[PDB]
Amino acid sequence: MRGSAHVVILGAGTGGMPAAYEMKEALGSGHEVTLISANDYFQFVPSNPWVGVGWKERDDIAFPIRHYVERKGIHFIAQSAEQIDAEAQNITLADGNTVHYDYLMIATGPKLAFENVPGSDPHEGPVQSIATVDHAERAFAEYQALLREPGPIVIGAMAGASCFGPAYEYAMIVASDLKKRGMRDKIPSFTFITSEPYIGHLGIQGVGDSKGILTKGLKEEGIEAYTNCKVTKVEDNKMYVTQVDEKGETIKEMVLPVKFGMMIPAFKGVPAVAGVEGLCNPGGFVLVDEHQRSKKYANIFAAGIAIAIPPVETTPVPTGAPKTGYMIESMVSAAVHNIKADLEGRKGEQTMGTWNAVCFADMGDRGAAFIALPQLKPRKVDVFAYGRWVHLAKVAFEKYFIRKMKMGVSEPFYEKVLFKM
Amino acid sequence: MRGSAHVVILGAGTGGMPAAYEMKEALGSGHEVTLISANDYFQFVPSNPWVGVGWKERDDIAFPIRHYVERKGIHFIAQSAEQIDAEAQNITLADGNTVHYDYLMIATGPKLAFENVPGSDPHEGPVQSIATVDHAERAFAEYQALLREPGPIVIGAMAGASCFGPAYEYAMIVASDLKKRGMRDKIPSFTFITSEPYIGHLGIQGVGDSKGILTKGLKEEGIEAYTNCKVTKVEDNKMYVTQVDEKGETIKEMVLPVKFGMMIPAFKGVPAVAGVEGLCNPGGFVLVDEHQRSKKYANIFAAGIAIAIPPVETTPVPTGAPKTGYMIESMVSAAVHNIKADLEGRKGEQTMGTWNAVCFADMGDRGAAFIALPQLKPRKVDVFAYGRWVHLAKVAFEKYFIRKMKMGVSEPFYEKVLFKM
Ligand SMILES: Cc1cc2nc3c(=O)[nH]c(=O)nc-3n(C[C@H](O)[C@H](O)[C@H](O)COP(=O)(O)OP(=O)(O)OC[C@H]3O[C@@H](n4cnc5c(N)ncnc54)[C@H](O)[C@@H]3O)c2cc1C
Ligand SMILES: Cc1cc2nc3c(=O)[nH]c(=O)nc-3n(C[C@H](O)[C@H](O)[C@H](O)COP(=O)(O)OP(=O)(O)OC[C@H]3O[C@@H](n4cnc5c(N)ncnc54)[C@H](O)[C@@H]3O)c2cc1C
Ligand SMILES: CCCCCCCCCCCCO[C@@H]1O[C@H](CO)[C@@H](O[C@H]2O[C@H](CO)[C@@H](O)[C@H](O)[C@H]2O)[C@H](O)[C@H]1O
Ligand SMILES: CCCCCCCCCCCCO[C@@H]1O[C@H](CO)[C@@H](O[C@H]2O[C@H](CO)[C@@H](O)[C@H](O)[C@H]2O)[C@H](O)[C@H]1O
Ligand SMILES: [S]
């Protein structure tokens, strides 16, 4: 309301959860902060691959949101938004109730676009997903079915994917786990299929020696690797693959039988957001400026996977660049700062800062990680690392991030770089 | 004097130069700041290898100090200190003049301990040095003499060395340059001799895949590599080498003829500092606390290579861990903060922070770099990188650091990490 702006945060995930705390922290007792999300629990996404192979339980990586935000003065609605009216500034919920806002911060993350590939939905065939804890549990179930009836494995990433790391992670740990069970030799063929123009492209034109190291890794595990692929359909438990050359001409087509599979899908914007007229690009990604403000509605901001980021490269098979945790946080932080400024007269000048990608993968006893910035080469930082220390660091971060989500954040979040002082 | 403390900074190098500016900045007009150094010019040390091979000129990496510090209110004495009396707080200069201090900050860097190896002094035989611009010019001169009369090459690092990177750098660029001159095939043998227990140990038990990558690098260039070596003497243009096993037993001895050589010497403390009673360890390194204060004299601080840092490992052939630029700056910064605190009543609580090593090497079109912290494994950061971008970064830093030394620093120096914002 007037003089007491009501701020809604849509989506309680990696960006949304912290955004809620920071927003409330920033605005204080004179403003209403409401968090709205499809699920009543928070889940630590980077842990889902491990759940997918049964190295982690839901209980380790997920928890109920309500108590933790409410004790901080945040209102929590565990309901999916079906409709957003940007003129009337009304959000229509699944149960039909409506919620008005003065400022809206969209943090809805990605829609998993299984529809791009008929048959690829995890409820439709053998190709599974590790994107969400629900999916990863399903993935693990099918993994156990494979153990009882060994057959071909196919892991990888679809056309239009942007999140490649987890596919490599999943493939490696699956291999690892098979060995641990003494089952690796019952698998007729283990194939890796990706839309990347080469192995270790990672949707960022490679980082450090990701190419050489991921190539050798797949080779060590007896995993056959195909690049420049798009899957045309999944049907009769077979994956129909089309492989192109640099100029997009077909050089071959394959039919791969799948007893067990996991392909990272392309991400689009969620429907309630994509459905807002003039808000998004054709992908359903919110078009925003450097301050995280919608280019169409001054009182709508966006952060995380939900926002549009221009491509810098056009690959033979469509691929996207990933939006990762540190950058998402900078986005969240900027948006909170600029909304608070709006509430106080000034235009917020705060930006997301320099584009970057940071990723950590844990193979069990050792991890791989990378840092690349800015987006185009030559970079200021372009580094790939591997070792037991990267594993120790993943462990540390999950433990830290989860605690922070229970305890609340103020907060210039990443002061965990204080390990220098 | 009383109420107007006189602060002397001894040594105008990587730590000393910034320390002078920061000290003056911190203390302002009410205090006298005096910089004292053996040379009247500043030199950018990491560039010396390139001078050693003639890829850089003295004029590119060195400049006269006086004008730049004096315009900032700093007094400059281009004179070497021969003697420090810590009781009377008097410094005796080369020309016999004496300078009193209320606080002394020692930044004298390393004494190059050629005396450990008879014949190894660059004025005594074929084994040269790239530690200083004077030495690197001499190194390059002998390099040209080798070109006129091709013979055996021997590059590497002595027993007790702590600065290994530059030896690898020098060996690589020498190889490179020989190829460019079409001379590489006139060289009878190119040998790399090091006290490291293995290639790419770097006095830090390795970082990332420094081992594999440096091993392959030397191999690519046709350079034969021996580890666990100590040189017993240089004589009749031959290098006498002794190689031990894990338990320090001799496994072989070699006599290597040298037409052209460069071995990084062991570093000790400079004599005027080592000569202060009870100030240093047997190496001549100033024993200080976490606040950079001498354990023996409350009004003496130290930073840079000059300070003592405990070993964490004992190698078959003695070796030391390097003290590098970022950590030196943290040391300088802490000391300035704590002296200013002293001048104002309180004990300064500021410390150097977490131990770390950062190094950059440029091979011409591409560079290698590393970051390791903290000192012992498993580390929080353990990374090795290579690429054209590392070369671009070295170039950038030299240009930046040199400008900063001419313009003055305040300054929480490393805000050049703002490339994130
Ligand atoms: C498997 C996996 C591994 C990853 N690993 C890394 C990594 O190691 N490091 C890293 O930096 N990045 C990682 N990423 C990338 C990225 O950090 C994550 O995808 C991250 O969770 C993105 O955060 P977000 O806030 O944009 O979206 P999300 O975390 O997905 O949050 C979106 C939220 O909005 C909710 N929502 C969606 N629609 C509605 C609606 N209509 N109404 C109400 N609520 C809705 C969702 O339920 C969800 O809670 C990983 C991604 C995946 C998929
Ligand atoms: C060849 C080389 C390459 C290097 N490369 C890197 C790298 O890439 N990155 C990095 O982080 N580190 C690098 N290092 C390590 C380290 O950063 C440098 O050695 C650095 O210069 C150390 O700074 P310092 O202030 O301790 O000593 P110095 O820079 O050596 O300064 C000591 C100063 O004190 C003066 N002095 C000594 N005795 C007296 C006296 N008695 N009276 C008056 N003045 C005196 C000297 O003339 C000199 O000016 C390199 C080192 C070397 C030798
Ligand atoms: C800073 C202190 C460290 C030591 C100082 C200098 C030591 C000399 C370095 C020698 C390296 C030479 O060898 C070089 O190594 C890297 C391997 O990682 C290779 O590079 C490889 O990984 C990089 C990523 O980092 C990729 O960009 C590249 O496509 C790939 O081939 C080069 O093909 C090889 O030429
Ligand atoms: C974070 C996103 C990136 C992708 C996600 C996961 C991809 C899978 C990673 C597969 C790597 C497997 O292969 C592994 O690679 C590194 C090579 O650099 C090797 O490790 C080598 O370099 C490292 C340093 O980084 C040294 O510690 C090691 O002694 C050396 O052998 C391992 O011997 C090899 O087992
Ligand atoms: S991702």
Ligand SMILES: [S]
């Ligand atoms: S060094």
